Symmetry: C2
Subunit: 65 residues, 2 copies
């Protein structure tokens, strides 16, 4: 419990969270046949994957894989 998001600092993670919390909102209008919402949904989904691949290229070498 705590309706108080952290501010978007210079971080893959702060942005990655900010994207995915947005994408959950745009499900309702996308399902309701709204073409602007499905665009925002897709836009963030690809943008999020971009941060995940930045984080993977880093953390996979930093792990042992």
């Amino acid at each position: 419990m705590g309706h108080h998001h952290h501010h978007h600092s210079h971080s893959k993670y702060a942005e990655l969270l900010a994207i995915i919390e947005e994408l959950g909102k745009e499900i309702r209008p996308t399902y309701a046949g709204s073409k602007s919402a499905m665009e925002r949904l897709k836009r963030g989904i690809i943008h999020a994957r971009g941060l995940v691949r930045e984080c993977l290229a880093e953390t996979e070498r930093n792990a042992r894989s």
Copy 2:
């Protein structure tokens, strides 16, 4: 052509990738008005969001600001 992934390292980022790319598909049946699809999309998004908070809070202890 970047469909080939790496062997998923024991990490939430690897699982996170697998979710978010699949959400890219989930846009199509959700927008179509499939009630099963909006539930898959949302389930994936709240799961993904949880993974990001786990690694964000951990990087909050690691990195300063």
